[PDB]
RNA sequence: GGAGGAGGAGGA
RNA sequence: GGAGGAGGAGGA
């Protein structure tokens, strides 16, 4: 995991 | 250095 | 949190 | 670029 990790919600 | 590193232009 | 830089809109 | 998560607006 990184931040919001590849849990890409907005998916930046 | 990190990205734009503590070269904080805006300094997000 | 620096190991990415992918990205700066967080900063550290 | 994953080790931070600080931050997700990049994603990798």
UniProtKB/Swiss-Prot annotation, chains A, B:
Q: Which gene encodes it?
A: PRNP
Organism from which the protein derives? Bos taurus (Bovine)
* Self-association and partners: Monomer and homodimer. Has a tendency to aggregate into amyloid fibrils containing a cross-beta spine, formed by a steric zipper of superposed beta-strands. Soluble oligomers may represent an intermediate stage on the path to fibril formation. Copper binding may promote oligomerization. Interacts with GRB2, APP, ERI3/PRNPIP and SYN1. Mislocalized cytosolically exposed PrP interacts with MGRN1; this interaction alters MGRN1 subcellular location and causes lysosomal enlargement. Interacts with APP. Interacts with KIAA1191. Interacts with ADGRG6.
Location comes to: Cell membrane; Golgi apparatus
Q: What is known of its domains?
A: The normal, monomeric form has a mainly alpha-helical structure. The disease-associated, protease-resistant form forms amyloid fibrils containing a cross-beta spine, formed by a steric zipper of superposed beta-strands. Disease mutations may favor intermolecular contacts via short beta strands, and may thereby trigger oligomerization.
Q: What is the lineage of its organism?
A: Eukaryota, Metazoa, Chordata, Craniata, Vertebrata
User: Any extra remark in the record?
Assistant: This protein is produced by a bicistronic gene which also produces the major prion protein/PRNP from an overlapping reading frame. The alternative prion protein/AltPrP (AC F7VJQ2) and PRNP have no apparent direct functional relation since a mutation that removes the start codon of the AltPrP has no apparent effect on the biology of PRNP. In mouse and hamster, the alternative initiation AUG codon is absent and is replaced by a GUG codon.
Query: Which family, according to the similarity comment?
Result: Belongs to the prion family.
Q: What protein does this entry describe?
A: Major prion protein
Q: What does this protein do?
A: Its primary physiological function is unclear. May play a role in neuronal development and synaptic plasticity. May be required for neuronal myelin sheath maintenance. May promote myelin homeostasis through acting as an agonist for ADGRG6 receptor. May play a role in iron uptake and iron homeostasis. Soluble oligomers are toxic to cultured neuroblastoma cells and induce apoptosis (in vitro). Association with GPC1 (via its heparan sulfate chains) targets PRNP to lipid rafts. Also provides Cu(2+) or Zn(2+) for the ascorbate-mediated GPC1 deaminase degradation of its heparan sulfate side chains.
Disease tied to this protein: Variations in PRNP are responsible of transmissible bovine spongiform encephalopathies (BSE), a class of neurodegenerative diseases that affect various mammals. These diseases are caused by abnormally folded prion proteins. BSE can be subdivided into at least three groups: classical, H-type and L-type, with the latter 2 collectively referred to as atypical BSE. Susceptibility or resistance to a BSE disease can be influenced by at least 3 factors related to the host prion protein: protein expression levels, number of octapeptide repeats, and specific polymorphisms.
